[PDB]
């Protein structure tokens, strides 16, 4: 009935953006269809799945706003369930014990064709016995083909003679991936399995397992893996979601970009989170792979910086301000910084770095800037601006702008004769955003003090 999807990562230490994209599509499918999104942690490997690695997944999903209706559900919590189902398949004659050694299985290297398991023990009905090579194998169908209509890839058909009686339970007491994932997806009523297409050849093995169990078979959707700019499969050697946080990308912008990587809607290129929910259908996902494009993502991030609500951007700027060890309380309000810089930067890291000049005293002047704009005569504009700014009853970006325009009009000069030296006065450089905001963001006390210093540096 109700659509139910899952994200089932195996913890490696961080959330790969390929995994983020998979979580995103599963989340969007569930949200668009008013269903549930389940978080499962494939944590049986006790070495890889440290608590720290699990926390990295959870923290990254929280940063992206990918809330989950259910979970996290841990495979290490479900061991007796896996063994119960495995042993019931044996009792029902649909799975069996086998005992071959690795070198016996290795001796089935004999290609001449494709390697697989002999099925030797399949009808031998061997009892359970204490043995380090004991496995439980599923009786896969011997003949015919497996068919499924992949939501993304279309009709897929694999011959059963290409499959074998897969191991479903290992000598070390743990299920195999193909067994655990079916039992989990069955137990949690998953209706649409949406995952990367490097899992696609295990799908017919899983489908047969559903059918041997007597479980309804879900639909499947397999996305091509994300490639890097050169076209190779992606890895940390821009893969960590938290790296994009540290670089200053907005979560919603990363999500819009990741969605557009393997999904499309006409010629639209930019999607709010609300638009993604409204428009997403896993069936509209691209079957062809796409490359990363850091430039497109920066472009996407610029749009979100330009159009999202200021209060939505603010906490992400504050994060970057704190990284730089800045006393945010003593400097300008971060919302005012966002207003002055949101149209002029590509990331919030860049925004924070360009905002440092308002959060600390001005001590280092660009010598070339002083030489160009603090020539004799510049004190007239500076003193007139200083006088008008000091008389403002209120200190706002608008009122500062009026004082600066009044200064130019009072002296009957172009705004450049005011802005150029004032820019060096406030920042020590000839690079800043709009002069009115640049002055405003220093605050009243700092603006007057810095201009006073500037007037003493004239000639």
Swiss-Prot record:
Record's subcellular location: Cytoplasm
BP GO terms, sorted: glutamyl-tRNA aminoacylation
Protein's recorded name: Glutamate--tRNA ligase
A Pfam entry, by short name: Anticodon_2
EC number from the UniProt entry: 6.1.1.17
SUPFAM superfamilies xref list: An anticodon-binding domain of class I aminoacyl-tRNA synthetases, Nucleotidylyl transferase
An example Gene Ontology CC term for this record: cytosol
């Amino acid at each position: 009935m109700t659509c139910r999807t899952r994200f089932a990562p195996s913890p490696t230490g961080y959330l790969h953006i390929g995994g983020a994209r998979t979580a995103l599509y599963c989340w969007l499918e569930a949200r668009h269809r008013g269903g549930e999104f389940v978080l499962r942690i494939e944590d049986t490997d006790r070495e890889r799945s440290t608590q720290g690695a699990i926390d990295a997944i959870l923290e990254a999903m929280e940063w992206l706003g990918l809330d989950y209706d259910e979970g996290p559900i841990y495979q290490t919590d479900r061991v007796a369930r896996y063994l119960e189902v495995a042993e019931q398949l044996v009792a029902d004659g649909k799975a069996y014990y086998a005992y071959e050694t690795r070198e016996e299985l290795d001796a089935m290297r004999e290609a001449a064709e494709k390697p697989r398991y002999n099925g030797a023990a399949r009808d031998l009905g061997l009892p359970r016995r204490d043995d380090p090579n004991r496995v439980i194998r599923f009786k896969n169908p011997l003949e015919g083909t497996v068919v499924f209509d992949d939501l993304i890839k279309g009709r897929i058909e694999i011959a059963n003679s290409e499959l074998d009686d897969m191991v479903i339970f290992r000598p070390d007491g743990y299920p195999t991936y193909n067994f655990a994932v079916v039992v989990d997806d069955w137990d949690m009523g998953i209706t649409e399995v949406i995952r990367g297409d490097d899992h696609i050849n295990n799908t017919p093995r899983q489908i047969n397992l559903y059918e041997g169990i007597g479980a309804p078979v879900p639909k499947f959707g397999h996305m091509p893996m994300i490639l890097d700019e050169q076209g190779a499969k992606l890895s940390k050697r821009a893969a960590d979601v938290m790296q994009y946080k540290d670089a200053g990308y907005l979560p919603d912008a990363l999500l819009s970009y990741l969605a557009r990587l393997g999904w499309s809607h006409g010629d639209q290129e930019l999607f709010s989170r609300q638009e993604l929910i409204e428009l997403f259908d896993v069936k509209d996902c691209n079957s062809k792979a796409s490359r990363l494009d850091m430039a497109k993502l920066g472009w996407v991030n610029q749009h979100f910086l330009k159009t999202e609500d200021v209060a939505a951007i603010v906490p992400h700027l504050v994060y970057q301000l704190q990284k730089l060890g800045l006393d945010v309380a003593a400097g300008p309000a971060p919302e005012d910084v966002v207003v002055a810089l949101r149209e002029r930067v590509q990331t919030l890291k860049e925004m924070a770095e360009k905002a440092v000049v308002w959060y600390q005293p001005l001590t280092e002047y660009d010598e070339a800037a002083v030489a160009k704009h603090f020539k004799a005569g510049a004190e007239v504009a500076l003193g007139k601006a200083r006088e008008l700014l000091a008389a403002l009853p209120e200190w706002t970006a608008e009122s500062v702008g009026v004082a600066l325009h009044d200064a130019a009009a009072a002296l009957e000069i172009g705004m450049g004769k005011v802005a150029q030296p004032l820019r060096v006065a406030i920042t020590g450089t000839q690079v800043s955003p709009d002069i009115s905001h640049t002055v405003y963001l220093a605050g009243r006390e700092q603006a007057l003090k810095r201009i006073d210093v500037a007037i003493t540096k004239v000639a």
